[PDB]
Amino acid sequence: QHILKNPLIINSIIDKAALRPTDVVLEVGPGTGNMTVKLLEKAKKVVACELDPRLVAELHKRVQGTPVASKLQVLVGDVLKTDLPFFDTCVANLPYQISSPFVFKLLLHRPFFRCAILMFQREFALRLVAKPGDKLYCRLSINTQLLARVDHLMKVGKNNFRPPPKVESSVVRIEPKNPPPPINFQEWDGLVRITFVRKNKTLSAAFKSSAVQQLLEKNYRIHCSVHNIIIPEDFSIADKIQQILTSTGFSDKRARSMDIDDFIRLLHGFNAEGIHFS
């Protein structure tokens, strides 16, 4: 666990969070409390999430006897599985291992928050803001960009932590779109996953997987049973997928160069024929 130690960077992160005196702040990875004690002066409540109970006892001691001690609430548990309460804003020092699950937990968290200011590994931050055609453009880029505005805010050298990690870090802002776009994110993610298995290969190739065929055949059976369609004896899911990809012009395209509108068009093409990624 890497403790952020530079006060200029801490002050910079708190400023970008745009705190209001009435805010509930969710602080993930509080460490020893260097950002925590600054948050408590500017916020109505700080909910710090910490898995280690011996860090909890010390963070608590460090604010004990302080006028703001009663504004600290410590959620002891693993953040990915816990039921996060309401908060207005999130600041977080996030280990790489949990960076992707934690972004989608925030994006699907209800009710909506205003802003999250998150510390990530450099590469992870670069994938968050990658654009179509970039070498780092991936599922993570497009899913985050569909659900949120995301900005790369500043680079953070490893010698600002203790102990120093062996990769550089980046601060990122994430603001969820509220309301989120009228896209079934469950189906979206099923489709985006399939196409990014091999993002430099075509979509035609991406759907020839037998795992893909199996999943779409299951869903198609549900569709046909629900609407009393009789599947002809010679029906072929592979042919039908290929027809749709061809009719909508996506057959030869690659996921690495597809933007959000391209995928909305792709998903529309499939759903129109009763093919769901559920």
Q: What is the CATH number of the domain that holds 269?
A: 1.10.8.480
According to the entry, how was the structure determined?
A: X-ray
| Binding site feature residues for S-adenosyl-L-methionine | 2, 4, 29, 50, 78, 93
| Among candidate residues 203, 213, 219, the one with its CA nearest the CA of residue 236 | 213
Residues 86 and 206 in one domain: no
Distance separating alpha carbons of residues 40 and 84, to the nearest angstrom: 19
CA 218/CA 240 separation, integer angstroms: 14
The experimental resolution of this structure, in angstroms, equals 2.4
Q: Are residues 36 and 141 in the same domain?
A: yes
Q: How many helices (H) and strands (E) does the chain have?
A: 11, 9
Range of the domain at 90: 1-180
Considering the domain architecture, whether residues 154 and 185 belong to the same structural domain is answered as no
Instruction: Indicate whether 186 and 95 sit together in one domain.
Output: no
Question: Does the N-terminal peptide bond of residue 21 adopt cis geometry, omega within 30 degrees of 0?
Answer: no
Q: Sort 111 into a burial class: Cβ within 10 Å, 0-12 / 13-18 / 19+.
A: exposed
User: Alpha helix (H) ranges present in the chain?
Assistant: 7-16, 34-42, 53-63, 99-108, 122-128, 139-147, 185-196, 203-206, 210-226, 237-247, 260-272
Give the CA-trace dihedral at 80, 82, 86, 90, to 10 degrees.
Answer: -30
> Are 196 and 270 part of one and the same domain?
yes
Domain endpoint, select from 180, 204, 235: 180
Q: How many CB atoms lie within 10 A of CB 21?
A: 8
Q: How far is CA 261 from the centre of its chain?
A: 19
| Secondary structure (3-state) at 243 | helix
Q: Rounded CA gap, 171 and 2, in Å?
A: 15
Residues 163 and 187 reside in one and the same domain: no
Q: Which residues contact 58 (CB under 8 A, 6 or more apart)?
A: 32, 33
Same domain, residue pair 223 and 168: no
Residue with tokens 């309401």: 86
Residue that is last in its domain, among 124, 152, 180: 180
Whether 145 and 64 share a structural domain? yes
Domain count, the chain: 2
Domain closes at, from 165, 180, 195: 180
**Residues flagged as binding site:** 2, 4, 29, 50, 78, 93
174 in Cβ contact with 235 (< 8 Å): no
